[model samples]
Target: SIQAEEWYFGKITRRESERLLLNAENPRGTFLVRESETTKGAYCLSVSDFDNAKGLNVKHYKIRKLDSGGFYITSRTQFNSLQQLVAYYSKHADGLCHRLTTVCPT
Candidate 1:
């Protein structure tokens, strides 16, 4: 079964978040940030899908923080890369699909 849960973290700054990724809490390639700029807080999680004829593909979903302090993913579209997802959200302000990042869960 698939499970979804809400997580909360108080006062997590951008620099602290980067430390999680940089120290390999989520590993190096697990996520992508919005655009080439490191200041944008938007990101996407790496995901996979099976194509009956084509086999497998690496897909991603855009994610952002809600004003309520929760996370939101508005669309069902899947992007080809972490960079692609990031690029989309960088321009749109509100893009599609998303994730949470406490410890990255390995």
Candidate 2:
């Protein structure tokens, strides 16, 4: 069904990032969805810390909607709003995106 293709994207918040970083090991350099500083009404998928202090240095991606109504993370990766680019690294126990537990920080 077309319903499976339906998705939404929300801007990430600093507090939310802080909450996620709490228990994360080497949480310095991570990725989160945030509002584009240079574009109004546009979202960006970026690294939490530009520096490698948290862990490793990472590249940033911009999530913009085109006239075609599609989301683009890069020239190759494109997906839904609520969904964005993630990685599955063997070294990491979990993927870049994982389900969170209860008691989310405000």
Candidate 3:
């Protein structure tokens, strides 16, 4: 069965994504996933938190793919689905700006 994650906001533009993230329960650690407009068959996870370590105002990671058709963020650890990735990162920031606290508030 497909993961019925509420955080998936497919096809939302970058600015709208920022808009949504800014309005979440707590902008700092909140995130949402969206279909990448500039890339085909790819997705991006938009985080409201700023990464001072990377000196970025917002953290947006391309859910990269492997030739073997697995999903991953910056690391090589593979995930079978987007929700799996989200669930993993939710428990620990690992390498994200912040641990995903929750999805956009409606």
Superposition error at 76 for model 1 (Å) = 11
Candidate 1 lDDT over 29-96, as tens digits, reads 33333211232555444332233663443344445554444334553544543344444544453322
Every model's Cα RMSD, please? Answer: 11.9, 7.4, 3.3
TM-score of candidate 2 to 2 decimals = 0.42
Tens digits of per-residue lDDT, candidate 3, 24-92, equal 245577788888879887789998775457433457888876667678886567798777888898887
**Deviation in Å, model 2, residue 19 alpha carbon:** 12
Q: lDDT winner between 1 and 2, please give it.
A: 2
* Pairs in steric clash, model 1: none
Between candidates 1 and 3, the one scoring higher on lDDT is 3
> Backbone clashes per model, in order?
0, 5, 0
Q: In model 3, what lDDT does residue 36 have?
A: 81
Please give each candidate's TM-score. Answer: 0.33, 0.42, 0.80
- Where model 2 places Cα greater than 4 Å from the true spot, the runs are 1-24, 27-29, 48-58, 80-106
Instruction: Identify the leading candidate in terms of lDDT.
Output: 3
Which has the greatest TM-score?
Answer: 3
